[PDB]
């Protein structure tokens, strides 16, 4: 080995060119001369390969003993270039040579192979041990999110992962000792034993170690399954127009179950809240919802965490409510008090205005950090008491800063230097550098009591301790999903659940024919309008007979849940009026009937004067594209009378044979404003097109100019 | 500063907004209707709808190309043995004798008891192959001093008019046959319901295309280019006779080796990717070239005999033509199967959308219909000026053919035309959507389209079809201008 290398160096240094390269080239400049290439670069690799595979000896052979184990020819087939053809080019081989090696070549050692390629072999066992549910055909609203492509053994920063691989494969060349070696000692040791005794090139080992330590995150279209174990099957999970239920093999993290738990509970409350007896429906759905393969009830009972939504569902299922909060490296459990969040634009001491959430009310919490166990007491934008137990410097350093960051004290916000959810960003800021935040706090006296003592910035006991340092549930649930104590004190409500719509890490299924009611805005919109189209004949017939029971058809309840709680009632008032007006004045428009019918479900809310609110567009939950146009077509709903095609969220359906002949020439102006009808053609004397405000501030009998859409002005009378 | 300069900048610097109307959309390339221009001639590498393959049962095996051609010619011995042919058509600069001699050399070589498919570099082969036609490279000094040596004026693609045959090709290639040519290998067995869904879909999608004329033409192109590229690398110095073949399968699953004719690969020292190798094609056809003579100016046609085809003696002609290709065209030919994916993806997307609406896989429903849903139909063409509807399968078979034609007739003219006419397509859509489109230089937009309309048979027919469809779109728009008035 060593002598062979030294003898080979001497042989190499005989060549005066090599002697020059080795002497003149710096260790840095190895990286440059390693890629040296004077050969003409191939511009068409796909063509060059199709060409080269028709030639005799297109492949390059590594000179050695193993190359020589390949014969010159086999049964007439020339395997490698002749000895009289070698020289100032090298020994080449045919593709047949590879075939010959895989047929009659040396049988090498494959011991450790499965342990080297563990990452790939787990990927296979996850598929092999997987279970497949139903495939279903319906709308899938996919969102483009940054997701992990492949599961990892233990995720690290690349620079950190690099050092760990060096300690495993090339310790002598690892360089300056790093603290990561001690942290990953149990990984290194384990990897050394696995990668002991294998003859595979260390570069391959390095790459395959990098695969299971260094993360690969990309933007991909997802739909309620974000965990890597799902992401690696993303191609089979869904398209835009179908869903495939997939349960991957192997075990899943509790943090993945917790995150999905919260998403599930938030979805159940958002659909339940709109029902008459939300608590009844919440219980019906919660019982039949599954997070991957585990029932929701099982996850809630098993995991000691979550949010408001989780506790509300716990109370509904008859489970003990946890009041657990996880603030990164801090774990709190509510002892007493109730806090409400109010997002206000507080000025921060670096030189920006960030929208941070102020928690009102006096609360007490059961804080914990490994060794440290304490009882906190915070008010609105302040810390008042903090009784903490004695523990290590490292365990106390976290808790004391975490307590003063989570309390959101006004001293912390006015002590930021440099360029930084906004609240969690402050946690990871003041954890790395703490000598900036303590200067922007102030110090006070230490208590000289029997159990009481104080500590300063040096992580030890001193008289200049930080300001405020002191170192030593049978609930009921209402129909409306409010958690009430025996004393009548409500400690949690539906209105306390987060509005944030996020993707579940694990695939959530609802074992109910009502599962479609749990869709996203675009999913629910598409299905709702499909239900209308499927029952249009009876729905339209019954409406023309004078009955209006269809207004409150069960099928529209789910739809209401994605209409903003404010406007739902006002939209219904307008919708019912416009509909009734169409049948009562014999000015029916089926496209408009279909469009507005679902908005008629909500209990109507009319103006103070008893007439309905007028509307230009009906805004639904989610992004700016999530709205219906009363007069116009919108991204969600558009009708073409030319071809009688109705486009809903890109899907095209024919209204052919569901349209009255006299309806095609009927202007939409009759079905656009409640208590208004088409008077005649545009009258320039009446002035500009009236706004909704001006149209609402019009006395009955007066005429006005309305614009339906570009190039359709109409004169309308009240 | 911006408002300062914007104030003093001339009103002559303007984006000239013009609100687009249907009336503004005049037909593209009006010269394609000019009867002074020659009708665009057939310029493809091989015959398509006019192909004739001599069928011979395969004994299961995939025997040598020379052997399978020999064995096929033995069964149609009369056509093989013809030494007294009638010259029907002659290409302006073609030597009929030299071509016929080269055909006889091919037949005699393919039919001989030797394994080699090499032709001797005879005076007729040398002429057909373009032996010693590259100009001699002299020294720059001599060339500079030589007054007669000039930089040649470039050849420009000639301006042609609509040819009836390009429609005929579209019509016949998109048509169903009794034969399947696709060579689709195996995949792993299905486990996931979605895998089972794809496999049940392929039974409709793949079988529709596989049976259509275009698929068989595609496979012929694919397999010929595959052998030709290998011959071009392996036998650079040798003139080689390469059979134009296909393995076709009938309804019962019986295999037949088709012989469409023989090709002569000339010398192929193909250094650069664009470097040309002369291929002289001798292809069988039932088509009389005199019926549509404007299609066939590139071809020298002999009448070599007759076959009894359907209670009738049908005449057999040999279409002879000096052609050429480079490495790139061969490699893209070898990849022409992907025509399947472009067509299949486009039509499966409609099935997936339709399934989204109904709640079950709408594949069978779209194709053949079911107890609930009527079969899905599409506007397919025109008959006596009236719009004709056809099936989902027909629509699939149209897109697939169109995608094959993109390969068969693909070049800078089609690249430029497709790219520039796409703007007009999207503007038309804006008028169809009533999204009030505005243009800044419409006549500049037409220039960029029309400069690409020259002698590409597909571009000229695409331009014709565009104008036809535009006319029907304009008629439809009259239903929309009445709405809400």
């Amino acid at each position: 080995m060593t002598l062979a290398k030294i003898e080979l160096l001497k042989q190499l240094l005989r060549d005066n060119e090599a002697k020059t390269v080795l002497k003149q080239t710096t260790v840095d400049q190895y990286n440059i001369i390693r890629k040296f290439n004077t050969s003409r670069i191939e511009k068409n690799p796909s063509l060059r390969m199709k060409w080269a595979m028709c030639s005799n000896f297109p492949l390059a052979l590594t000179k050695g003993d193993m190359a020589n184990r390949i014969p010159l020819e086999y049964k007439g087939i020339q395997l490698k270039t002749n000895a009289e053809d070698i020289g100032t080019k090298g020994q080449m081989c045919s593709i047949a040579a590879v075939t010959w090696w895989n047929t009659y070549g040396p049988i090498g050692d494959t011991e450790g192979f499965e342990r080297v390629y563990e990452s790939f072999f787990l990927r296979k066992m996850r598929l092999d041990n997987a279970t497949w549910g139903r495939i279903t055909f319906g709308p899938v609203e996919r969102v483009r999110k940054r997701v992990l492509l492949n599961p990892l053994t233990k995720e690290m920063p690349p620079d950190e992962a690099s050092n760990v691989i060096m300690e495993i494969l090339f310790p002598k060349e690892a360089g300056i000792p790093r603290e990561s070696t001690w942290i990953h000692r149990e990984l290194i040791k384990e990897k050394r034993e696995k990668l002991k005794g294998t003859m595979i090139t260390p570069i391959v080992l390095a790459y395959m170690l990098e695969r299971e330590l260094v993360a690969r995150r990309r933007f991909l279209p997802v739909a309620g399954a974000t965990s890597a174990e799902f992401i690696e099957m993303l191609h089979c999970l869904q398209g835009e127009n179908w869903r495939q239920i997939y349960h991957p093999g192997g075990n899943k993290l509790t943090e993945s179950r917790s995150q999905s738990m919260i998403v599930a509970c938030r979805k159940i409350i958002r659909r339940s809240i709109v029902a008459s007896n939300p608590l009844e429906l919440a219980v019906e759905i919660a019982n039949k919802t599954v997070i991957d393969t585990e029932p929701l009830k099982s996850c809630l009972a098993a995991i000691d965490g979550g949010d408001v939504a989780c506790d509300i569902i716990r109370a509904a299922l008859g489970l003990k409510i946890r009041q657990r909060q996880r603030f990164g490296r801090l774990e709190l459990k509510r002892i007493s008090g109730r806090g409400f969040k109010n997002d206000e634009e507080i000025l921060i001491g670096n030189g920006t205005i960030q929208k941070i959430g102020i928690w009102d009310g006096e609360e007490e919490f059961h804080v914990r950090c490994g060794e440290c166990r304490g009882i906190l007491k915070k008010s609105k934008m302040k810390l008042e008491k903090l009784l903490i137990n004695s523990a290590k410097k490292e365990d106390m350093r976290d808790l004391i800063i975490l307590c003063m960051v989570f309390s959101q004290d006004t001293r912390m916000f006015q002590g930021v230097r440099g360029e930084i959810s906004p609240m969690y960003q402050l946690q990871r800021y003041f954890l790395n550098r703490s000598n900036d935040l303590f200067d922007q706090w102030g110090y006070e006296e230490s208590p000289k009591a029997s159990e009481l003592h104080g500590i300063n910035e040096s992580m030890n006991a001193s008289d200049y301790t930080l300001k405020g340092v002191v170192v030593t549930e049978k609930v009921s649930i209402t129909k409306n999903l409010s958690l009430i104590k025996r004393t009548g004190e409500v400690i949690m409500g539906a209105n306390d659940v987060s509005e944030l719509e996020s993707q579940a890490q694990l695939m959530i299924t609802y074992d109910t024919p009502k599962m479609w009611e749990m869709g996203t805005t675009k999913e629910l919109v598409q299905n709702t309008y499909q239900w209308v189209l499927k029952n249009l004949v009876t729905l339209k017939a019954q409406f023309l007979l004078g009955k209006e029971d269809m207004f409150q058809w069960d099928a529209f309840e789910a739809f209401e849940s994605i209409i903003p709680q404010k406007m739902a009632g006002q939209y219904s008032g307008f919708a019912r009026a416009v509909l009734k007006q169409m049948r009562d004045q014999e000015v029916m428009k089926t496209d408009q009937f279909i469009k507005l019918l679902p908005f008629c479900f909500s209990p109507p809310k009319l103006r103070s004067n008893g007439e309905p609110y007028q509307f230009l567009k009906l805004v639904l939950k989610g992004g700016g594209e999530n709205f219906i146009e009363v007069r116009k077509g919108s991204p969600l709903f558009s009708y073409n009378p030319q071809t009688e095609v109705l486009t809903i969220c890109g899907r095209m359906m024919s209204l052919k044979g569901k349209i009255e002949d006299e309806e095609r020439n009927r202007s939409m102006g009759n079905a656009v404003l409640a208590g208004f009808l088409v008077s005649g053609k545009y009258d320039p004397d009446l002035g500009d097109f009236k706004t909704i405000e001006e149209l609402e501030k019009l006395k009955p009998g007066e005429k006005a100019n309305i614009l339906l859409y570009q190039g359709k002005p109409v004169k309308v009378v009240k | 500063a911006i408002e300062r300069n914007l104030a003093r900048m001339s009103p002559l610097v303007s984006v000239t907004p013009k609100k687009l109307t249907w009336e503004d959309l005049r037909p593209i390339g009006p010269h394609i209707y000019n009867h002074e221009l020659p009708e665009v001639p057939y310029n493809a590498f091989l015959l398509m709808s006019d192909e004739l393959g001599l069928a011979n049962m395969t004994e299961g095996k995939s025997k040598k190309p020379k052997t399978l051609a020999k064995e096929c010619l033995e069964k149609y011995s009369t056509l093989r043995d013809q030494t007294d042919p009638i010259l029907i058509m002659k290409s302006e600069k073609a030597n009929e004798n030299f071509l016929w001699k080269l055909w006889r050399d091919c037949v005699n070589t393919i039919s001989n008891e030797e394994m080699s498919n090499e032709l001797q570099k005879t005076n007729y082969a040398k002429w057909a192959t373009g032996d010693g036609l590259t100009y001699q490279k002299i020294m720059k000094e001599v060339a500079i001093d030589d007054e007669t040596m000039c930089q040649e004026e470039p050849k420009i693609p000639n301006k042609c008019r609509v040819a009836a045959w390009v429609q005929t090709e579209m019509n016949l290639l998109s048509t169903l046959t009794s034969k399947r040519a696709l060579d689709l290998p195996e995949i792993g067995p299905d486990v996931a319901p979605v895998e089972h869904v794809g496999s049940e879909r392929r039974k409709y999608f793949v079988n529709e295309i596989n049976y259509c004329k275009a698929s068989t033409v595609m496979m012929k192109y694919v397999l010929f280019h595959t052998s030709l590229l290998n011959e071009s690398n392996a036998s650079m110095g040798k003139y080689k006779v390469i059979p134009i073949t296909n393995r076709v399968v009938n309804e019962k699953g019986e295999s037949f080796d088709m012989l469409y004719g023989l090709a002569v690969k000339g010398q192929s020292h193909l250094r650069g990717d664009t470097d040309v190798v002369t291929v002289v094609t001798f292809e069988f056809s039932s088509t009389d070239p005199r019926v549509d003579s404007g299609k066939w100016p590139k071809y020298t046609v002999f009448r070599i005999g007759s076959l009894f085809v359907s209670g009738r003696e049908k005449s057999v002609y040999l279409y002879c033509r000096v052609n050429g290709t480079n490495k790139i065209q061969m490699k893209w030919g070898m990849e022409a199967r992907r025509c399947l994916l472009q067509s299949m993806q486009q039509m499966e997307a409609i099935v997936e959308q339709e399934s989204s609406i109904q709640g079950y896989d709408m594949t069978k429903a779209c194709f053949k219909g079911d107890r609930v849903n009527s079969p899905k139909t599409f506007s397919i063409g025109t008959q006596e000026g009236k719009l004709v509807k056809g099936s989902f399968g027909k629509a699939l078979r149209v897109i697939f053919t169109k995608c094959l034609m993109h390969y068969v007739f693909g070049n800078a003219q089609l690249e430029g035309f497709s790219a520039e006419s796409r703007r007009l397509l999207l503007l038309i859509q804006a008028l169809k959507d009533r999204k009030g489109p505005w243009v800044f230089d419409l006549e500049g937009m037409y220039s960029g389209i029309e400069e690409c309309i020259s002698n590409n048979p597909w571009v000229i027919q695409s331009a014709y079809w565009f104008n036809e469809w535009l006319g029907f779109e304009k008629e439809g728009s009259k239903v929309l201008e009445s709405v809400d008035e």
Binding site: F137, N535, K547, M550, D554 | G359, N373
Partner: peptide, 21 residues
């Protein structure tokens, strides 16, 4: 059933008219 069979789509919400007799 089979995905291509119309009865593979689940029974959808259907509006049934109301009458007190």
């Amino acid at each position: 059933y089979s995905p291509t069979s119309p009865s593979y789509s689940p029974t959808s919400p259907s509006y049934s008219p109301t009458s007190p007799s």
